[PDB]
Amino acid sequence: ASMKFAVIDRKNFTLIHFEIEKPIKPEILKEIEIPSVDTRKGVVISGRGPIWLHCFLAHKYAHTPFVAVYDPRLGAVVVQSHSELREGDVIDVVVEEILK
Amino acid sequence: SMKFAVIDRKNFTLIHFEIEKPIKPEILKEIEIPSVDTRKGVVISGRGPIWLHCFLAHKYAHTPFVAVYDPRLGAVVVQSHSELREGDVIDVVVEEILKGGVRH
RNA sequence: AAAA
Protein backbone atom coordinates (compact mmCIF):
# COMPACT_ATOMS: atom_id res chain seq x y z
CA ALA A 1 0.00 0.00 0.00
CA SER A 2 3.11 2.27 0.50
CA MET A 3 4.60 0.70 -2.72
CA LYS A 4 3.61 -0.81 -6.14
CA PHE A 5 5.47 -2.62 -8.97
CA ALA A 6 5.04 -2.31 -12.74
CA VAL A 7 6.50 -5.36 -14.57
CA ILE A 8 7.26 -4.74 -18.29
CA ASP A 9 8.51 -7.53 -20.64
CA ARG A 10 11.37 -6.73 -23.08
CA LYS A 11 13.39 -9.09 -25.38
CA ASN A 12 16.58 -9.11 -23.24
CA PHE A 13 15.23 -8.20 -19.75
CA THR A 14 12.24 -7.70 -17.50
CA LEU A 15 11.81 -4.05 -16.35
CA ILE A 16 10.69 -3.93 -12.66
CA HIS A 17 9.62 -0.33 -11.80
CA PHE A 18 8.45 0.54 -8.22
CA GLU A 19 6.33 3.58 -7.23
CA ILE A 20 6.46 4.65 -3.55
CA GLU A 21 3.22 6.51 -2.53
CA LYS A 22 4.48 7.53 0.99
CA PRO A 23 7.90 7.34 2.73
CA ILE A 24 8.82 3.70 3.53
CA LYS A 25 10.49 2.26 6.66
CA PRO A 26 13.11 -0.53 6.43
CA GLU A 27 10.69 -2.96 8.26
CA ILE A 28 8.92 -3.06 4.80
CA LEU A 29 11.76 -5.31 3.40
CA LYS A 30 10.32 -8.09 5.72
CA GLU A 31 6.77 -7.68 4.19
CA ILE A 32 7.38 -6.79 0.44
CA GLU A 33 6.10 -9.29 -2.18
CA ILE A 34 8.73 -9.27 -5.05
CA PRO A 35 7.48 -9.74 -8.66
CA SER A 36 8.15 -13.25 -10.14
CA VAL A 37 10.04 -12.94 -13.46
CA ASP A 38 11.26 -15.06 -16.32
CA THR A 39 14.55 -16.21 -14.62
CA ARG A 40 16.09 -16.84 -18.08
CA LYS A 41 16.13 -13.02 -18.68
CA GLY A 42 18.06 -10.35 -16.74
CA VAL A 43 16.24 -7.68 -14.70
CA VAL A 44 16.36 -3.84 -14.86
CA ILE A 45 15.25 -2.28 -11.52
CA SER A 46 13.78 1.28 -11.69
CA GLY A 47 12.20 3.66 -9.16
CA ARG A 48 12.61 6.75 -6.94
CA GLY A 49 13.38 5.20 -3.56
CA PRO A 50 16.03 4.61 -0.93
CA ILE A 51 19.43 3.06 -1.91
CA TRP A 52 18.65 0.17 0.55
CA LEU A 53 15.39 -0.69 -1.38
CA HIS A 54 17.41 -0.83 -4.64
CA CYS A 55 20.17 -3.02 -3.01
CA PHE A 56 17.48 -5.29 -1.47
CA LEU A 57 15.72 -5.78 -4.87
CA ALA A 58 19.01 -6.21 -6.83
CA HIS A 59 19.97 -9.07 -4.44
CA LYS A 60 16.48 -10.66 -4.92
CA TYR A 61 17.17 -11.05 -8.72
CA ALA A 62 20.80 -12.31 -8.34
CA HIS A 63 19.55 -15.77 -9.57
CA THR A 64 18.89 -14.22 -13.11
CA PRO A 65 21.46 -13.68 -15.92
CA PHE A 66 22.19 -10.05 -14.86
CA VAL A 67 20.83 -7.19 -12.76
CA ALA A 68 20.90 -3.59 -14.05
CA VAL A 69 19.93 -0.49 -12.04
CA TYR A 70 18.14 2.32 -13.91
CA ASP A 71 19.89 5.76 -13.91
CA PRO A 72 17.62 8.37 -15.63
CA ARG A 73 20.89 10.12 -16.78
CA LEU A 74 22.35 7.10 -18.65
CA GLY A 75 20.15 3.98 -19.06
CA ALA A 76 20.37 0.79 -16.98
CA VAL A 77 23.82 0.16 -15.45
CA VAL A 78 24.73 -3.54 -15.15
CA VAL A 79 25.70 -4.03 -11.44
CA GLN A 80 25.71 -7.90 -11.47
CA SER A 81 26.63 -10.16 -14.44
CA HIS A 82 26.14 -13.91 -13.74
CA SER A 83 25.78 -15.32 -17.26
CA GLU A 84 25.38 -12.24 -19.55
CA LEU A 85 26.77 -8.65 -20.12
CA ARG A 86 29.59 -7.07 -18.00
CA GLU A 87 29.38 -4.93 -14.81
CA GLY A 88 29.53 -1.29 -15.94
CA ASP A 89 27.75 -1.93 -19.31
CA VAL A 90 24.77 0.44 -19.93
CA ILE A 91 21.46 -0.85 -21.41
CA ASP A 92 19.86 1.87 -23.60
CA VAL A 93 16.39 2.02 -21.98
CA VAL A 94 14.29 5.19 -21.30
CA VAL A 95 11.86 4.15 -18.50
CA GLU A 96 10.14 7.59 -18.43
CA GLU A 97 9.04 7.04 -22.11
CA ILE A 98 7.68 3.53 -21.27
CA LEU A 99 5.73 4.94 -18.22
CA LYS A 100 4.53 8.05 -20.24
CA SER B 1 37.86 9.65 -9.21
CA MET B 2 36.66 7.39 -6.28
CA LYS B 3 38.57 6.17 -3.13
CA PHE B 4 37.73 3.85 -0.18
CA ALA B 5 38.11 4.12 3.64
CA VAL B 6 38.09 0.75 5.49
CA ILE B 7 36.93 0.99 9.17
CA ASP B 8 37.31 -2.34 11.04
CA ARG B 9 34.84 -3.03 13.89
CA LYS B 10 34.19 -6.31 15.77
CA ASN B 11 30.56 -6.45 14.44
CA PHE B 12 31.23 -5.33 10.80
CA THR B 13 33.60 -3.79 8.35
CA LEU B 14 32.52 -0.26 7.32
CA ILE B 15 33.46 0.47 3.66
CA HIS B 16 33.06 4.23 2.98
CA PHE B 17 33.72 5.51 -0.56
CA GLU B 18 34.40 9.12 -1.66
CA ILE B 19 33.89 10.44 -5.25
CA GLU B 20 36.20 13.36 -6.34
CA LYS B 21 34.18 14.11 -9.57
CA PRO B 22 31.23 12.50 -11.46
CA ILE B 23 31.87 8.80 -12.32
CA LYS B 24 30.89 6.90 -15.48
CA PRO B 25 29.52 3.31 -15.33
CA GLU B 26 32.76 2.10 -17.07
CA ILE B 27 34.48 2.62 -13.63
CA LEU B 28 32.83 -0.66 -12.42
CA LYS B 29 35.25 -2.56 -14.79
CA GLU B 30 38.34 -0.81 -13.20
CA ILE B 31 37.44 -0.45 -9.41
CA GLU B 32 39.69 -2.37 -6.96
CA ILE B 33 37.36 -3.65 -4.10
CA PRO B 34 38.85 -3.52 -0.55
CA SER B 35 39.43 -7.06 0.82
CA VAL B 36 37.67 -7.61 4.18
CA ASP B 37 37.45 -10.24 6.93
CA THR B 38 34.77 -12.40 5.17
CA ARG B 39 33.57 -13.76 8.56
CA LYS B 40 32.21 -10.26 9.43
CA GLY B 41 29.33 -8.47 7.65
CA VAL B 42 29.82 -5.27 5.65
CA VAL B 43 28.29 -1.75 5.98
CA ILE B 44 28.57 0.25 2.70
CA SER B 45 28.45 4.07 2.92
CA GLY B 46 29.07 6.95 0.52
CA ARG B 47 27.60 9.69 -1.68
CA GLY B 48 27.27 8.13 -5.10
CA PRO B 49 24.91 6.71 -7.70
CA ILE B 50 22.50 3.89 -6.71
CA TRP B 51 24.26 1.60 -9.28
CA LEU B 52 27.61 1.99 -7.45
CA HIS B 53 25.92 1.04 -4.11
CA CYS B 54 24.26 -1.99 -5.77
CA PHE B 55 27.58 -3.03 -7.39
CA LEU B 56 29.37 -2.85 -4.00
CA ALA B 57 26.53 -4.68 -2.07
CA HIS B 58 26.82 -7.63 -4.55
CA LYS B 59 30.70 -7.68 -4.23
CA TYR B 60 30.27 -8.24 -0.40
CA ALA B 61 27.37 -10.78 -0.68
CA HIS B 62 29.90 -13.57 0.20
CA THR B 63 30.01 -12.12 3.83
CA PRO B 64 27.43 -12.84 6.60
CA PHE B 65 25.37 -9.69 5.73
CA VAL B 66 25.42 -6.43 3.74
CA ALA B 67 23.94 -3.21 5.21
CA VAL B 68 23.54 0.10 3.40
CA TYR B 69 24.01 3.34 5.37
CA ASP B 70 21.03 5.74 5.45
CA PRO B 71 21.85 9.01 7.31
CA ARG B 72 18.19 9.15 8.50
CA LEU B 73 18.25 5.65 10.15
CA GLY B 74 21.56 3.78 10.47
CA ALA B 75 22.74 0.85 8.31
CA VAL B 76 19.76 -0.98 6.74
CA VAL B 77 20.37 -4.75 6.30
CA VAL B 78 19.60 -5.57 2.58
CA GLN B 79 21.08 -9.18 2.66
CA SER B 80 21.59 -11.56 5.65
CA HIS B 81 23.09 -15.04 6.15
CA SER B 82 23.38 -14.26 9.93
CA GLU B 83 21.15 -13.56 13.00
CA LEU B 84 20.39 -10.16 11.25
CA ARG B 85 17.18 -10.04 9.12
CA GLU B 86 16.62 -7.90 5.97
CA GLY B 87 15.10 -4.57 7.11
CA ASP B 88 16.95 -4.64 10.50
CA VAL B 89 18.85 -1.35 11.17
CA ILE B 90 22.38 -1.31 12.65
CA ASP B 91 22.91 1.75 14.94
CA VAL B 92 25.87 3.51 13.26
CA VAL B 93 26.40 7.26 12.56
CA VAL B 94 29.01 7.40 9.77
CA GLU B 95 29.16 11.24 9.96
CA GLU B 96 30.49 10.80 13.55
CA ILE B 97 32.81 7.84 12.63
CA LEU B 98 34.46 10.04 9.89
CA LYS B 99 34.89 13.21 12.05
CA GLY B 100 38.51 14.51 11.81
CA GLY B 101 38.96 12.95 8.33
CA VAL B 102 39.80 9.34 7.36
CA ARG B 103 42.61 8.40 4.91
CA HIS B 104 40.96 6.86 1.77
C1' A C 1 14.53 8.83 -1.70
C1' A C 2 17.26 6.99 -8.91
C1' A C 3 24.84 11.07 -6.82
C1' A C 4 22.85 8.10 0.50
Author numbering:
A (entry chain A): -1 to 98
B (entry chain B): 0 to 103
Provide the authors' own sentences about this structure as they appear in the paper.
We demonstrate that Csx3 is, in fact, a cA4-specific ring nuclease, for which we propose the name Crn3 (CRISPR-associated ring nuclease 3). The enzyme has an unusual cooperative reaction mechanism involving the association of two dimers, bridged by the cA4 substrate, to complete the active site.
In parallel with the biochemical analysis, we crystallised the H60A variant of Csx3 and soaked the cA4 substrate into the crystals. The structure was solved using molecular replacement with data to 1.84 Å resolution. The electron density clearly showed a molecule of cA4 bound between adjacent dimers of Csx3. Notably, the Csx3 structure presented here crystallised in a different space group to those structures published previously, which has allowed the arrangement of Csx3 dimers into a pseudo filament arrangement with a cA4 molecule sandwiched between the D69 and H60 faces of the protein. The rotation between adjacent dimers in the filament is 144 °, coupled with a translation of 28 Å. The one interaction evident from the H60 face with cA4 is a strong (2.4–2.5 Å) hydrogen bond between H80 and the 2’-OH of the ribose ring. Interestingly, R71 moves around 3.3 Å in order to form bidentate hydrogen bonds with an oxygen atom of a phosphate group, which we predict is adjacent to the phosphodiester bond that is cleaved. We see no evidence for the ion in our crystal structure, which may be due to the deletion of the H60 side chain.
